[PDB]
């Protein structure tokens, strides 16, 4: 079977304002993103989205879909299920909340079918208990019979999906088993059936979490099928800032998610006549809500990044810019330089505005 293209939106919600926070969606999304890229998917991965941002992202996803295109949605975070409809809960959901604060997966499915996709895959890594406060009874149009729909639910209706408390960089339970099967060259239904059996050996979750598979896929389609973001993943180029005093500072940028970028700085040149100099970043747009106590750390790990010292240049200072989708205007920040001349006593301070526009998903 052939795909016209293969596109995936992955969303991982953790930083809930009014509900228990989660931890593993970060690692689950990161790792599924890379696995899907190995299978030649165009992937948008996003963390910590509000209701408005989740709908925007689905709208963007749906734009990428067309006839014959494989579309895959993965969601890791709080969810629930009422009356056969699954809902994804955004990080700004009130408590209590209801269906109007959430995205109904069946609505997304209907919209994808209208693009005449060749395959629709939903992997829902979320709880599926009822929401007693949500007594809306909205019957959607009967979906068309396109015989190309596959759901892999991390858990069964009325049950919870889990991740391991206090477990560092461990996956949630679903991704823990999915990750070791995703690359198999097998019909997606068969692949998921295998994951279900792997999970049936997980002692921790037996009797509480089991995969549910729902499928009407009547062709042997797989995530590996041959294909026969553009403005969504633009990264500013590395730049070399030369200050008046001769010091030069390298500024580099790394994508961690489509809405999380790491900036890092290092001294690449210090004139002989200057004895000491430090460079740091500051004055980021208020929208990104960067806390300066969290910036200019000696290690990526200290910024709360999934990235470790070995995936990035060494001996820099790193700053994590999450929530890039909130960036309304241009990403303008300041590179400050402190230095001192041999023979002098005064610490001199220079600064320089830098403007890299709207990176990654901020680009809209």
């Amino acid at each position: 079977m052939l795909a016209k293209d293969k596109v995936a939106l992955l969303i991982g919600n953790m930083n809930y304002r009014e509900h228990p926070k989660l931890k593993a969606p970060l690692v689950d999304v990161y790792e599924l993103t890379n696995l899907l890229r190995q299978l030649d998917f165009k992937v948008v991965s996003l963390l910590d989205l509000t209701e408005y941002e989740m709908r925007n992202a689905v709208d963007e996803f749906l734009l990428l879909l067309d006839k014959g295109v494989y579309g895959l949605l993965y969601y890791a975070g709080h969810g629930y299920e009422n009356f056969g409809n699954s809902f994804m809960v955004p990080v700004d959901a009130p408590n209590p909340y209801r269906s109007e604060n959430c995205l109904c997966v069946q609505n997304i499915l209907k919209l994808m079918q209208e693009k005449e996709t060749g395959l629709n895959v939903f992997l829902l890594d979320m709880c599926r208990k009822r929401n007693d406060y949500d007594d809306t009874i909205p019957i959607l149009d009967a979906l068309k019979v396109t015989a190309n729909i596959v759901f892999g639910y991390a858990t069964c209706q009325g049950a919870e999906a889990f991740e391991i408390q206090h477990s560092g960089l461990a996956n949630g339970i679903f991704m823990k088993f999915l990750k070791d099967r995703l690359l198999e060259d097998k019909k997606i239904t068969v692949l998921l059936d295998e994951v279900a059996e792997d999970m049936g050996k997980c002692h921790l979750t037996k009797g509480k979490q089991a995969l549910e598979i729902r499928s009407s896929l009547s062709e042997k389609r797989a995530l590996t099928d041959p294909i026969q973001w553009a403005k969504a993943h633009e990264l500013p180029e590395s730049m070399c800032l030369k200050f008046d005093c001769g010091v030069q500072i390298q500024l580099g940028f790394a994508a961690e998610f489509s809405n999380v970028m790491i900036i890092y700085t290092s001294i690449v040149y210090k004139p002989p006549e200057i004895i000491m100099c430090d460079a740091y970043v500051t004055d980021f747009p208020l929208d990104l809500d960067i806390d300066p106590k969290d910036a200019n750390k000696g290690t990526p790990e200290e910024t709360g990044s999934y990235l470790v010292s070995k995936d990035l240049p060494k001996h820099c200072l790193y700053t994590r810019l999450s929530s890039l989708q909130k960036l309304k205007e241009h990403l303008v920040f300041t590179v400050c330089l402190s230095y001192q001349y041999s023979g002098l006593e005064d610490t001199v301070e220079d600064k320089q505005e830098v403007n890299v526009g709207k990176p990654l998903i901020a680009k809209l």
């Binding site: 228990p20 709080h78 969810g79 890594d125 709880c127 999906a161 889990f162 408390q165 949630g172």
Partner: peptide, 4 residues
């Protein structure tokens, strides 16, 4: 040990 932690539900979603």
């Amino acid at each position: 040990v932690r539900p979603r």
